[PDB]
Amino acid sequence: PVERYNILTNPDAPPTQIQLPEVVDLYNVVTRYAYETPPITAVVMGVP
Amino acid sequence: RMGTPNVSKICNFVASCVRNRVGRFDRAQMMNGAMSEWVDVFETSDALTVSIRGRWMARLARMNINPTEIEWALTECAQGYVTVTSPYAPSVNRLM
Amino acid sequence: QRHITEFISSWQNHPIVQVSADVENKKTAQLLHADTPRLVTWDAGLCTSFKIVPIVPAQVPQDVLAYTFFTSSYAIQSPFPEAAVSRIVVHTRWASNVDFDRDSSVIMAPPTENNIHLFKQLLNTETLSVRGANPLMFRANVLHMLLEFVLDNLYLNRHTGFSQDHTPFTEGANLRSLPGPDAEKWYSIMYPTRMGTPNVSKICNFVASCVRNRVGRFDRAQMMNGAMSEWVDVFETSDALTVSIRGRWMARLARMNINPTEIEWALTECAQGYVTVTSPYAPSVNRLMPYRISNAERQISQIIRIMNIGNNATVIQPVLQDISVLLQRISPLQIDPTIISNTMSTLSPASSILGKLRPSNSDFSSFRVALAGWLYNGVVTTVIDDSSYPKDGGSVTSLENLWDFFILALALPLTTDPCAPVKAFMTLANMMVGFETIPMDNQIYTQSRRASAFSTPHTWPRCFMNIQLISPIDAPILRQWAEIIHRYWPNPSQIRYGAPNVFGSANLFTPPEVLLLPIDHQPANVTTPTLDFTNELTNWRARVCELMKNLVDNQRYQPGWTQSLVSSMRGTLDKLKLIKSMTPMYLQQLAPVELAVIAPMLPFPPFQVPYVRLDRDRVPTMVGVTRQSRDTITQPALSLSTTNTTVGVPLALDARAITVALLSGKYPPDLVTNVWYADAIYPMYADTEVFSNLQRDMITCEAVQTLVTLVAQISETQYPVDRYLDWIPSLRASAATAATFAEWVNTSMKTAFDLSDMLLEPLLSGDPRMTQLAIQYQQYNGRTFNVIPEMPGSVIADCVQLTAEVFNHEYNLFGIARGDIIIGRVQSTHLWSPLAPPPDLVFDRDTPGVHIFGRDCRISFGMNGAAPMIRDETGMMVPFEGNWIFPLALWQMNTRYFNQQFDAWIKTGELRIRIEMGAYPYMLHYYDPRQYANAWNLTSAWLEEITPTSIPSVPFMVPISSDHDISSAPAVQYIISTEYNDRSLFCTNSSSPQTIAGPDKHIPVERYNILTNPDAPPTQIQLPEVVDLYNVVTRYAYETPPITAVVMGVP
Amino acid sequence: FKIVPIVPAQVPQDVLAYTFFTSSYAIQSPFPEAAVSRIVVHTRWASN
């Protein structure tokens, strides 16, 4: 199904365009995050 | 990436697919000694699970708090009996 | 010769000699720690990397075998190689002779042998098979190969003697003698003119045709040592490119030359005239002392040094430690806290403080460290633990806390911390809470807030910022303290340092000749009176003591005391206040003189930034570095300096010990400062390693410049570099890939100079493709200072560009085959060469109906007689016939598939396909024309070796050379090149005077233009098209003296 | 979601050269090679 691979099948098609809910694309551009989740004691220091 | 010596339906479909939409789409790389916090890339996948995860990230992003805010809060709670301190530096991406 | 430096004192019989640490006999002598290569070399052998090889010897009939002179007969021997075909081969410095080796020599095997390892020497390390290399790595490999050739050629030609000759033609004539044996064989090669040519032959005709004048020593220096001239000019076989490169290296040495008298004057200035060193130098005609350099090179090196520190306090600790040891034995002053204890002669507040002090420890390393830190102001920070301050902020009623406060007040001025005044003020406010009131502008920050939290100017309180804003009534003691601090706050100082003639200074954030100090200094005078309140420290101590006395006067601050301690407290404080410590006096005069002497002594130039004692807005916040040129726009990324907020490394030290030292300083009673300092300096001057450090720094600078230029050469960098070999295949490497390739080139360079030490390791973190380095620091108000040095060029880079152009002209001699070849089986009776096949047989590039195929062309398949047809670029499947153009990549992508589709067509099909090759290394195989030849099996093997990652080594089959007509037999070859590639062949059948049959190659007149053409001037070159392999050249002899100083007492 | 193969093709056959089929070399393909195949939901089938 071209609709399921539209991002590749159509060069003119926008990367973010979706065919939902008519067709579920099986090839997608994905954003992966490396944001840190450090402990408060790591950056916040108590001073006597 | 598959080659198409054959004229098979798979070969024809691959030939139809855009050649250039491959590899990391984009990345957060520019600051001195800063690796990309996030990167965009084209790959096989499904948007709907990606959408669910995106909403989860959105809610978590909605709840995030910053270290300076925490320093002020702890110091205020101490009321001068206790003192805590936080440094000032460029955003390094910490989820609180 | 092991001794490089000799020092002799006149007032003591203790001469001192310094030698390189690399020597095997360090008996009672100083050594050279830095790892350093020997850049200058002398050569006993020919600097030749290329030798023509004659493959097959030949025979010509001669009735008489000898020259006719008297009754004797002389045999005829050709210096020229005898072969049906002869071609040059690569062996860098093959004819050179030296004890020391660059260990970078390159020997190239004959075309019949595989040299794939050299072609894939660099990034092709990740190759499935040793045979075969990825083409896109080829450009990087070629560039590195040229670099190695240049490094291997870094030598100087030693002047050599000439000898009377015993060969009959020039018997008794003087011939410069090559080392040991073969000199006559060498003579025959340089002067085949010496060889007679009685028989008639192509070689003989050429020798007879040659001009007699282009031979022998061109000229000699009239000045000479014994029978040997200082310099000479002679005609002999050589390559101009290498000679030119060596000339550039020599030119760099000529610029670097430095003079001893300048050194003597500079040494006297550094000594400040303390002692007279004697360094008169006997003049040397060839005297060489290359020590001329630029402060800009030093700046680049120091930026590298700062990156090398790279946030490691541990690395700085050792230099500071050695410096402190020197200061400890470079100071004749004595510290006596026990004397303070004896003067005291001791519930007692004095007893409490004494128990707290435990003054028994006699170590003052921290004090010396503090002086060293003052020297490195920019990279050094003095910090104090809050725990050093009174627990819980101290208590107004605590006498022990009062002792802590007094010691803290004494060391508070000492702290280099800029916000330290704010912290001390906050500390006093914290103790004062409930007695004096301090207003806070911000609710979040409290009067009891720990001062250490206020480590920065932006946290300085507005109430704190204006004394008038605070009510004097609210905190009158505090108000007075603020006024007194303003009235008596300590003054830091700047002192002149460095010598312009030679060492100079590369200071950027600070004036180059000025040394910054956190302490004001004054002219030295031991006779000065002890009670001088003009001394800042004395005045500060007095004011602080009186202020404390006023505070404790009513005892309002300390209720709960059954007895009044005012009289006793006042006496103890009075004794401390009136102490005539000379430590401030020593720091004011003696410390500056000593620091000034040690500054040249310091191995590493200190890093400092301007001192702003009260300039809060102008206080700098941090220092950062940039790798790219200003014009470029790029993502800002994380850097090591940003992580550390502190500009300088933080140091926390024991306040009590420092305060006690400050209260306990005395000089030796009969000490002669000039004598003590001179005695210490003489050995210290005798042990200096400055020259070696300068040499390593200069090498590092050359490497850095070469690296930036190379980064632009193989990658996208703003720095301009000419690329004529972009045709040479290369991909766009990721920044990481380029960095790894760079790391391999760097390891190669270190091994090439035999470097046991790290090179540019801070530079090896990343961002090799950096257009311009820049470094800057900013103030709390936000003003900033940016320092950018001017790039100094590298001899290697210019030589590289010249060689690159030479390679482009000589790549066939270089052995890489440019262009593509056409696939066509061919059988013929003609004499045309494999490199010169019939053009009509080949379809030319500008031909109609040739077929190129698009990426989408899956071939059609026929089952049970159905018609398979190759999908065309146009998308029409076609039969396997015609002339086609195939991109090389497609075959590698589908090598098995293509072979399968055309295997019958390949073996017997007439279809001709052109695969675009552009350039490639080639392999040559000689073949016999008079016997049946079939490459079809060979072609099948080569195609199978074709693979997606890379393709098999190109095999060429050529006929064996012959000087006479020969029969031929059918031969099948499917490989057809599009061009003649036989320019590498020096000559064919040279033995024959004329060619009976086949292709003919003759000795090149242009390469022998000086001998071949009389009109041509002796110094004429035909580069890059024609390379003469023999030319007139100059060899000279030079002398370098050892460092020697004779030290005498100054009047 | 992962695609699944439903019906195999009638291969090999005498008229059709096996050399024609890429799958005959057992070359890895992006999609299943079969007479019938349909997409299937398999939650976290490839997740780690």
PDB file of C-alpha atoms in Angstrom, chain B residues 1-8 11-13 15 19 27-35 37 71-72 75 79-80 83 85 87-88, chain C residues 444-446 448-450 452-453 458 625 634-642 645 855-861 871 877 894 897-898:
ATOM      1  CA  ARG B   1      18.963   0.449   0.513  1.00  0.00           C
ATOM      2  CA  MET B   2      17.933  -2.782  -1.296  1.00  0.00           C
ATOM      3  CA  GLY B   3      19.246  -2.953  -4.905  1.00  0.00           C
ATOM      4  CA  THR B   4      16.820  -3.683  -7.776  1.00  0.00           C
ATOM      5  CA  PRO B   5      18.437  -5.902 -10.474  1.00  0.00           C
ATOM      6  CA  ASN B   6      14.977  -7.591 -10.427  1.00  0.00           C
ATOM      7  CA  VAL B   7      11.672  -6.050 -11.629  1.00  0.00           C
ATOM      8  CA  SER B   8       9.851  -7.730  -8.700  1.00  0.00           C
ATOM      9  CA  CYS B  11      11.850  -3.856  -6.369  1.00  0.00           C
ATOM     10  CA  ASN B  12       9.247  -1.633  -8.095  1.00  0.00           C
ATOM     11  CA  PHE B  13       7.900  -0.362  -4.744  1.00  0.00           C
ATOM     12  CA  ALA B  15      12.154   2.297  -6.784  1.00  0.00           C
ATOM     13  CA  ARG B  19      15.827   8.038  -2.462  1.00  0.00           C
ATOM     14  CA  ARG B  27      19.896  16.876  15.324  1.00  0.00           C
ATOM     15  CA  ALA B  28      20.365  19.424  18.161  1.00  0.00           C
ATOM     16  CA  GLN B  29      24.144  19.980  17.554  1.00  0.00           C
ATOM     17  CA  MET B  30      25.868  23.427  17.648  1.00  0.00           C
ATOM     18  CA  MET B  31      26.982  24.568  21.147  1.00  0.00           C
ATOM     19  CA  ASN B  32      30.602  24.226  22.299  1.00  0.00           C
ATOM     20  CA  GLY B  33      30.963  20.744  23.867  1.00  0.00           C
ATOM     21  CA  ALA B  34      27.216  20.086  23.527  1.00  0.00           C
ATOM     22  CA  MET B  35      25.950  16.834  21.929  1.00  0.00           C
ATOM     23  CA  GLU B  37      19.803  16.786  23.109  1.00  0.00           C
ATOM     24  CA  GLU B  71      17.306  26.167  45.471  1.00  0.00           C
ATOM     25  CA  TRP B  72      15.012  29.095  46.265  1.00  0.00           C
ATOM     26  CA  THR B  75      16.256  28.070  51.198  1.00  0.00           C
ATOM     27  CA  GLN B  79      13.835  30.289  56.648  1.00  0.00           C
ATOM     28  CA  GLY B  80      17.543  31.077  57.255  1.00  0.00           C
ATOM     29  CA  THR B  83      20.903  27.471  53.336  1.00  0.00           C
ATOM     30  CA  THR B  85      22.600  26.859  46.720  1.00  0.00           C
ATOM     31  CA  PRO B  87      24.764  27.409  40.157  1.00  0.00           C
ATOM     32  CA  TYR B  88      23.858  29.393  36.990  1.00  0.00           C
TER      33      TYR B  88
ATOM     34  CA  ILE C 444      15.018  34.848  49.858  1.00  0.00           C
ATOM     35  CA  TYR C 445      18.514  35.920  51.023  1.00  0.00           C
ATOM     36  CA  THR C 446      18.774  36.250  54.839  1.00  0.00           C
ATOM     37  CA  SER C 448      22.115  34.691  58.539  1.00  0.00           C
ATOM     38  CA  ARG C 449      22.460  33.336  54.960  1.00  0.00           C
ATOM     39  CA  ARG C 450      25.824  31.544  54.664  1.00  0.00           C
ATOM     40  CA  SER C 452      29.725  31.119  50.897  1.00  0.00           C
ATOM     41  CA  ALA C 453      26.338  31.170  49.112  1.00  0.00           C
ATOM     42  CA  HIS C 458      25.156  39.442  41.282  1.00  0.00           C
ATOM     43  CA  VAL C 625      37.843  29.226  23.364  1.00  0.00           C
ATOM     44  CA  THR C 634      27.773  27.263  13.356  1.00  0.00           C
ATOM     45  CA  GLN C 635      25.966  25.485  16.224  1.00  0.00           C
ATOM     46  CA  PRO C 636      27.436  26.451  19.654  1.00  0.00           C
ATOM     47  CA  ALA C 637      28.383  23.220  21.484  1.00  0.00           C
ATOM     48  CA  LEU C 638      29.391  22.174  25.035  1.00  0.00           C
ATOM     49  CA  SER C 639      33.035  22.916  26.042  1.00  0.00           C
ATOM     50  CA  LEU C 640      35.189  21.984  29.101  1.00  0.00           C
ATOM     51  CA  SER C 641      35.754  25.603  30.264  1.00  0.00           C
ATOM     52  CA  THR C 642      31.978  26.297  30.456  1.00  0.00           C
ATOM     53  CA  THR C 645      32.154  28.567  36.644  1.00  0.00           C
ATOM     54  CA  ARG C 855      19.560   3.034 -10.672  1.00  0.00           C
ATOM     55  CA  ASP C 856      16.064   1.552 -11.259  1.00  0.00           C
ATOM     56  CA  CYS C 857      16.824  -1.118 -13.914  1.00  0.00           C
ATOM     57  CA  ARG C 858      16.067  -4.656 -12.600  1.00  0.00           C
ATOM     58  CA  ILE C 859      16.880  -6.957 -15.574  1.00  0.00           C
ATOM     59  CA  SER C 860      13.996  -8.889 -17.217  1.00  0.00           C
ATOM     60  CA  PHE C 861      14.143 -12.722 -16.945  1.00  0.00           C
ATOM     61  CA  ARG C 871      15.961  -2.805 -17.761  1.00  0.00           C
ATOM     62  CA  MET C 877      14.361  -3.882 -21.222  1.00  0.00           C
ATOM     63  CA  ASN C 894      25.168  -6.459  -8.904  1.00  0.00           C
ATOM     64  CA  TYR C 897      23.759 -10.768 -11.194  1.00  0.00           C
ATOM     65  CA  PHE C 898      25.482  -9.018 -14.141  1.00  0.00           C
TER      66      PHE C 898
END
